[PDB]
Ligand binder design. Structure first.
Ligand SMILES: CO[C@H]([C@H](C)/C=C/N(C)CO)[C@@H](C)C(=O)CC[C@H](C)[C@H](C[C@@H]1OC(=O)C[C@@H](O[C@H](N)O)C[C@H](C)C[C@H](O)[C@H](C)[C@@H](OC)c2coc(n2)-c2coc(n2)-c2coc(n2)/C=C/C[C@H](OC)[C@H]1C)OC
Ligand SMILES: Nc1ncnc2c1ncn2[C@@H]1O[C@H](COP(=O)(O)OP(=O)(O)OP(=O)(O)O)[C@@H](O)[C@H]1O
Ligand SMILES: [Ca+2]
Ligand SMILES: [Ca+2]
Length: 363
């Protein structure tokens, strides 16, 4: 009996089989319907046929907002991407920190009534990422395509009163890179061009240890410049934009947001926790999600947190190499454990108790 693990993000779905080291399927969280031969398309195919479709993202800042399109995503995941019959597999799903109770119930109803799963469970994304690092205590910085959270976790369980949310993440960074490249004299505005710039961001951007110092290097030399061959055949050159783009995480004012940067929100989150556990959190800052993939980010975070924390505090930033998929991995591990098998919501329990069973069984 093989459990499935489906990690639904704002930008990407990561899906596969519990016990595997990586998701089998990773595809965009998009649903397309024809503009005025199929009635709907999902993921890669929807992207490929965009010219004749209207696209929608059913998950916004980590929260499911379009339930009909979300059902389409799950159907596509089971039947087309993984090629499984969902009625044959226990299914672990993930959710954002502070996901409303009613959303959890809707997820539960759909899984049992629409897909007829034999069992299910819903876990908090950041908690899973911590488990994937071999820890049950620490503070997670989870940053994806749509949302960023700080989530302190103690002895296996999130501390909800100390969780911080920031609606600044990868899509915002892609858009800002587009803007600053256009200012350089290139032209990136269209949808095809957004996809191109996202690739540039992922290949060439990095976090500077010191922003001003690196700006000065870029102003007076070509040493930080890299080139990129566009699909249309123009080779462009990229310099300070490489580190200016993700600098926005530390200084959101670059895109006109008033928020604290990720170092300050981490600190604020720790300070909302019991004094007895803060040292444990400071020593176990774990980074998760695609927007934490920038080279240089761990060292920069070490620097910035050290400057905020008491002078004698021991601080460690952990940045696992597989952290694009840490949420999914944690789910794969959790759903594999013998101790976990009693934690599943069963179809019998659903049939008797209804969707609210999820509140009794899922932390
Ligand atoms: C039962 O759950 C309770 C509670 C009821 C739940 C509460 N909530 C859900 C709260 O919200 C919960 C508190 C708790 O116990 C969770 C435990 C965690 C999932 C986790 C469990 C441990 O698990 C852990 O400690 C996880 C770590 O395993 C190891 N062995 O140290 C992960 C590594 C550091 C990194 C990977 O090697 C690396 C990322 C990569 O390696 C190739 C990899 C990718 O995928 C995998 N590894 C993978 C997928 O499946 C597995 N690995 C697998 C499936 O089973 C296991 N491994 C078993 C490993 C033995 C571990 O102990 C060393 C395991 C017990 O501990 C951090
Ligand atoms: N090497 C990289 N450098 C910078 N960003 C990257 C890199 N790899 C992936 N990303 C970005 O990570 C994002 C996707 O990450 P992830 O899958 O963790 O997000 P999600 O789960 O879809 O979104 P969210 O968690 O915000 O709901 C995209 O914005 C993508 O461009
Ligand atoms: Ca995510
Ligand atoms: Ca500011």
């Amino acid at each position: 009996t093989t459990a499935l693990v489906c990690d639904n993000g704002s930008g990407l779905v990561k899906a596969g089989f519990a016990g595997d080291d990586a998701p089998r399927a990773v595809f965009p969280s998009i649903v397309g319907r024809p503009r005025h031969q199929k009635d709907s398309y999902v993921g890669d195919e929807a992207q490929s046929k965009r010219g004749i479709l209207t696209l929608k993202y059913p998950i916004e800042h980590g929260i499911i907002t379009n339930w009909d399109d979300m059902e389409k995503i799950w159907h596509h995941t089971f039947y087309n991407e993984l090629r499984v019959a969902p009625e044959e597999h226990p299914t672990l799903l993930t959710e954002a920190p502070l996901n409303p109770k009613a959303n959890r119930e809707k997820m539960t109803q759909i899984m049992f009534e629409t897909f007829n799963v034999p069992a299910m469970y819903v876990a908090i994304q950041a908690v899973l990422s911590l488990y994937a690092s071999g820890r049950t205590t620490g503070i997670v910085l989870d940053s994806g395509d749509g949302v960023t959270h700080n989530v302190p976790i103690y002895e296996g369980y999130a501390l909800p009163h100390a969780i911080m949310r920031l609606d600044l993440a990868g899509r915002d960074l892609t858009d800002y890179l587009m803007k600053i490249l256009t200012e350089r004299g290139y032209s990136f505005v269209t949808t095809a061009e957004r996809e191109i710039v996202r690739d540039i961001k992922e290949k060439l951007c990095y976090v500077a240890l010191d922003f001003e110092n690196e700006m000065a290097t870029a102003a007076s030399s070509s040493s930080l410049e890299k080139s990129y061959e566009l699909p249309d055949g123009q080779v462009i050159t990229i310099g300070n934009e490489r580190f200016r783009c993700p600098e926005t995480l530390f200084q959101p004012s670059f895109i006109g947001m008033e928020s604290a940067g990720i170092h300050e929100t981490t600190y604020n989150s720790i300070m909302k926790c019991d004094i007895d556990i803060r040292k444990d959190l400071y020593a176990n800052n774990v980074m998760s999600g695609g927007t934490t993939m920038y080279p240089g980010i761990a060292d920069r975070m070490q620097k910035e947190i050290t400057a905020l924390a008491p002078s004698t505090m021991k601080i460690k930033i952990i940045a696992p190499p597989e952290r694009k998929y840490s949420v999914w991995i944690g789910g794969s591990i959790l759903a594999s454990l013998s101790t976990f098998q009693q934690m599943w919501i069963t179809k019998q329990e659903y049939d008797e108790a209804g969707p609210s069973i999820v509140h009794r069984k899922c932390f």
